[PDB]
Design a protein around this ligand. Structure first.
Ligand SMILES: Nc1ncnc2c1ncn2[C@@H]1O[C@H](COP(=O)(O)OP(=O)(O)O)[C@@H](O)[C@H]1O
Ligand SMILES: Nc1ncnc2c1ncn2[C@@H]1O[C@H](COP(=O)(O)OP(=O)(O)O)[C@@H](O)[C@H]1O
Ligand SMILES: Cc1cn(C/C=C/CP(=O)(O)OP(=O)(O)O)c(=O)[nH]c1=O
Ligand SMILES: Cc1cn(C/C=C/CP(=O)(O)OP(=O)(O)O)c(=O)[nH]c1=O
Ligand SMILES: [Mg+2]
Ligand SMILES: [Mg+2]
Lengths: 200, 200
């Protein structure tokens, strides 16, 4: 009764997370795999996120926590979950707003299902800035993006998490190939041990 | 331009918090004072609280955080705020559900406006159990009430907070008299220093 893997895709805005997450799920299914995106706008907590920045940070964490019974059930059924943004983006975005410390930002997400694999989609900030995605002012805020990346860097220092850096500057097919190999390795190997808990 | 005091009334279910909070505000106004109750059911976050216990805990904290701009503005205007339950009840109730540690429960409320006075309405659990208030199953859950009290006790160990224990077993008028003297002392004295931050 082999459990599914919990795979998280992280990285700055326009790194290719939505593109690569959908590509991964569909390729795995062509294995039992499902896609999860944070924030999940469909729930009641998600509908509130559609000001007070601490409330917003907590609402983003409560949106992750409300999906925990679903996460655990799917994983126990043998379904691998591909997650487009998790607690790491939560800490990075609030940390990019800068008013609050990394320690305060991490705390609400402490205890969440620990990912078996955290894919960090790395690319130069100037490389992501020249990408075909618009619709958010924060994309053009260079300073915000630099602070968000600094937050991601500090979070990668945690030796307990299975962080795997992927060169996100490469072609759609080459980035997919790297993500596919690492994800398949996680489904076969990382699933041997029971599902852990984030930052504890 | 003397700021208002932030006064919090705490204690187990049926200690007399709703009774004493309304009595205090109206007596002070007979001074500029307003009543605040947590949870505040009128807001959007409050409307969600009207399951997943971590999400609920975070929603209760986000409900406190959304009132922070209002709290700071009222206090700066010279309005004393009388608060019926705060972060202490947040930590006590989730702690009474028991699955989570006091440290995790405290973290989301870290940074909130620090009360100038925390009134703890003490009375024997058996004294509160024989009181004229019903409508909640948790009132009859003796074990839950004992754990909630244990959580309140641990929170009172914090030497940085101005905790004042009041004998809540006494008559409505005698409990009011004690709360009135301590509240008036806080309005005159505690307001000298700037508004602090909870648990930091
Ligand atoms: N390897 C790639 N090379 C160039 N553009 C890409 C690549 N992968 C994705 N994109 C494009 O970059 C933009 C952002 O991709 P997206 O998947 O939305 O990233 P994210 O979800 O990380 O913000 C989109 O316009 C997408 O089509
Ligand atoms: N000093 C008191 N002696 C006896 N009953 C009291 C006293 N103060 C309040 N009560 C009653 O006890 C019950 C709970 O009071 P309440 O203000 O709702 O407490 P809480 O808000 O702490 O749960 C009510 O029925 C109230 O009328
Ligand atoms: C997880 C997570 C995400 N975001 C950023 C919020 C992103 C939601 P959007 O900007 O409306 O949509 P796209 O970034 O997908 O284009 C955040 O601020 N905190 C979080 O915990
Ligand atoms: C602050 C706060 C309160 N409560 C308990 C929730 C109480 C709301 P009710 O039980 O519906 O109403 P009455 O207790 O006033 O009768 C909680 O669980 N967490 C908190 O942060
Ligand atoms: Mg995306
Ligand atoms: Mg009450």
């Amino acid at each position: 009764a082999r459990r599914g893997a919990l795979i998280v895709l992280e990285g700055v805005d326009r790194a290719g997370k939505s593109t690569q997450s959908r590509k991964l799920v569909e390729a795995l299914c062509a294995h039992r795999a499902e896609l999860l995106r944070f924030p999940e706008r469909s729930t009641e907590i998600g509908k509130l996120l559609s000001v007070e920045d601490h409330s917003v940070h907590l609402l983003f964490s409560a949106n992750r926590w409300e999906q925990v019974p679903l996460i655990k059930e799917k994983l126990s059924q043998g379904v691998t979950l591909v997650v487009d943004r998790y607690a790491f983006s939560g800490v990075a975005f609030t940390g990019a707003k800068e008013n609050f410390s990394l320690d305060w930002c991490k705390q609400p997400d402490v205890g969440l299902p620990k990912p078996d694999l955290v894919l960090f989609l790395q690319l130069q900030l100037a490389d992501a800035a020249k990408r075909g995605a618009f619709g958010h002012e924060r994309y053009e805020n260079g300073a915000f993006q630099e602070r968000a990346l600094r937050c991601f860097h500090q979070l990668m220092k945690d030796t307990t998490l299975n962080w795997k850096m992927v060169d996100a500057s490469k072609s759609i097919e080459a980035v997919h190939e790297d993500i596919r190999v690492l994800s398949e390795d996680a489904i076969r190997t990382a699933t041997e041990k029971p599902l852990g808990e984030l930052w504890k």
